Amino acid sequence: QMNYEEVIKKYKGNENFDHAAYDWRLHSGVTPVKDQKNCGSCWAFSSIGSVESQYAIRKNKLITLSEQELVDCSFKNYGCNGGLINNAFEDMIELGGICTDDDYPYVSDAPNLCNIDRCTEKYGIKNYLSVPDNKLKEALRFLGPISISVAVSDDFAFYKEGIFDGECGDQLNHAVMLVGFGMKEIVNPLTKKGEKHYYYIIKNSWGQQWGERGFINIETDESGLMRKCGLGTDAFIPLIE
Amino acid sequence: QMNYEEVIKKYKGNENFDHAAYDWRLHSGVTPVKDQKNCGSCWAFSSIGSVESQYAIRKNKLITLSEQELVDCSFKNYGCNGGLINNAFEDMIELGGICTDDDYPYVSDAPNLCNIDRCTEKYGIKNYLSVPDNKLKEALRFLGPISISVAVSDDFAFYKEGIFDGECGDQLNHAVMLVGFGMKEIVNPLTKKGEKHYYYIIKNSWGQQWGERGFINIETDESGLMRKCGLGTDAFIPLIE
Ligand SMILES: [Cl-]
Ligand code: NA
């Protein structure tokens, strides 16, 4: 909702930001990685995650919120059976905040009723924007991490490190969040030349013991338009201001 | 990167230096002991300390650096859950500089995002060498304090002063730094003759209020080759020149 252009003006400084790299991790913009365990609640971890980052950035406070509370009360979704990023933010506004991760611990696939009263300090969001398929690097630089969707292939799970550029999935089947971009200049193992390999920085929800400390890097170009595997086809970022 | 021999040659130089004792503490080479508390920051405190000494020596400046920024930003380590000296030095260079421990105070196990911008005067290192497993005393005398590893056994810890000697090694499980050696001449409790007891000087991270102002003495021989408990299996010294 809202209007990209409408908010980007209120934040963006007209300065053709550095398009090669910016990493929210090393700017107090990325909360610790969590682990969805055996429940298909990706949609929830990513949306919750983008909110945590909005807080860590804007209102400068670190707080982990209950993903479990979304799986239990977001009726516009299907709990462990999947959901949609934007629906989450929707139900988030309806619920007027979510209980901290501490008063409403996560319990994965274990049946669990929805109890909104399990706490008294609910953390919420004023509204949420949608980012244009070709304004990712720009939004990431001034608005913050973005909740997005992507097609995850079977080999995608084995990824242990580097700049993934493997097989993609059928269609958009997973929700993760974008936290920044970077660019390592590797050598052409064949021509042996200074080549520039650009990449996006993803935060998964499979615990730290997966990929680079829980994060994965996706190839892309300087412009930040090469969205491999359908990258950010669906892209939203919550707003608390 | 820098491979030991290239720089060690630029410094060592044969020399019949006294192999019995040299103590960087009383040569303006050892900054005050710190306390990692109930957070597994062995590796960071050890590496940081060697940097503090390098500045205190080469650039004749007394400076204490932020261990908290390493636990939060190297990513080649696992914050309070442990890490490795060399990984730290790597990432230290990647980040190009570290906040002083005053602009980036330590908060042990207390959650804390990584903000490389938490300061404006960042102190760094050009590169880092690995010192030979049988060249410690030699290195200490000319290169400066060394970051090392050791196996702390269960009966240790009560040590309040003197030259602790009791626990044996295993696989390692803690990170500290070597700061010098000495040799006290006790009397022969059996034949009563002039016996020579050599020892190493380690710099811990459990505050001044522990042992002799925080330090402990480990047995060793004149050659500086008897590394009980693996003393220095892994040994590195950062370089700022
Ligand atoms: Cl974990
Ligand atoms: Na985790």
Ligand code: NA
């Ligand atoms: Na880093």
